[PDB]
Structure 1
Amino acid sequence: GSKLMQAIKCVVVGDGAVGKTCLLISYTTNAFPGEYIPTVFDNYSANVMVDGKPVNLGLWDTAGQEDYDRLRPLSYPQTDVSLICFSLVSPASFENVRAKWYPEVRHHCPNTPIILVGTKLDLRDDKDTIEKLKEKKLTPITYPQGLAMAKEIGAVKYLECSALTQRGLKTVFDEAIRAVLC
């Protein structure tokens, strides 16, 4: 016979090259891609156990660019939760959380929970990356900094993760799910 289960829609946004597309791949295939990385991940829906009852998790990747700006809006309808991603080693991606992504989502999805995701957690303690940024008066975003951004945009949870090491990765999606079951 059949039984019902929860089906949840999830939409990921954020500046180009913050790691959106890799996050999704690494999570759903347990493999960070070598070369070739589509702009937007093939639309794709995952069954995840949570507290003993399975849940269907529809992952909608996005981009922005120029074709991609007419496209992104079409993902928003009926969204249950949305992740706003930015790169921990790109303060400009951080600024667009307040400036761009937060307002865009609240426009299209009033009342839907938002998680803020700081990405590329592995690169924060990488001296190559840190030196490059020192070389132009920049430094990584810290936790209390991201946590405060999350507080200010009314995000339900702030989470750091690294698609490459998978370090925070599974937590991000568990919390995304959890935020929808209240």
Structure 2
Amino acid sequence: GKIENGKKALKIVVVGDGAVGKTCLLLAFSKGEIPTAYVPTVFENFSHVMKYKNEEFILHLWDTAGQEEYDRLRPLSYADSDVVLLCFAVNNRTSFDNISTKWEPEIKHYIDTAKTVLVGLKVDLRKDGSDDVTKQEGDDLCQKLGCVAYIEASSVAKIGLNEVFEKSVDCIF
């Protein structure tokens, strides 16, 4: 619950296994596309203005990673976070299981006061006949972990991107 110029402001941190699509989520959400160019391991934190209810919110968006120096820097990203997106890829069951084994506990340790939103990324990839994570599985995990919501999204297909960040704003304001 911050106010930075005259605009309500929110800090959102994005966490989850490598390659679940965290950097693409932020690029697609804020830039409206994923550029054909070298995608960085971690996007430096930045502010994005989002027009929502009928007002403007300033979102302070923090990408994170677990490779190279970013693994060591990650804990420092959490301070004063209002919302944490717990991200996995729906076609990667390992990443889903790690929400419970690694990511939710890490968040509870460093920033228990943050609200969490469970985010099922790469939903464009879900298909019958594999062991892809279902919407019911995401809903159940959200329930067990006390997240505010489970939201499915695709950066590539532009599905659910605004919903993720609109729900983030909603649970704070």
Band the TM-score falls in, shorter-chain normalisation = over 0.9
User: Could you tell me how far 1:3 is from its partner in structure 2?
Assistant: 5.9
Amino acid of the structure 2 residue aligned with 1:122 = D
Paired residue type of 1:103: P
Counterparts of 1:80-91 in structure 2 under 5 Å?
80-91=82-93
Provide the secondary structure at the position in 2 that maps to 1:83.
strand
Q: Deviations over 1:59-101 (max 9, x none)?
A: 0000002422210001100001110100000000001000000
Runs ≥4 in structure 1, deviation > 3 angstroms?
A: none
**1:163 maps to what in 2?**
155
Q: How well do the aligned residues superpose, as a CA RMSD in angstroms?
A: 1.6
Paired with 2:152 and 2:137, the residues of 1 have a C-alpha distance of 12
> Equivalent pairs: percent with the same residue?
43
Residue number in structure 2 paired with 1:37: 39
Structure 1 stretch displaced more, 30-39 or 86-95: 30-39
- Counterpart Cα distance in 1 of 2:109 and 2:73: 16
Aligned pair 1:120/2:112, yes or no?
no
Q: How do 1:68-147 and structure 2 match up within 5 A?
A: 68-125=70-127, 139-147=131-139
Q: Looking at CA atoms only, which structure, 1 or 2, has the larger radius of gyration?
A: 1
What is the aligned partner in structure 2 of residue 16 from structure 1? 18
Deviation of 1:4 (Å): 2.2
Map of 1:151 onto structure 2: 143
Structure 2, unpaired ranges of 5+: none
- Alignment partners' CA distance in 2, 1:113 and 1:63: 20
3-state SS, counterpart of residue 126 of structure 2? helix
Give the alignment's TM-score, normalised by structure 1. Answer: 0.89
- Structure-2-length-normalised TM-score: 0.93
Q: Residue in 2 aligned with 1:174?
A: 166
Aligned residues: 170
Amino acid at match of 2:52: V
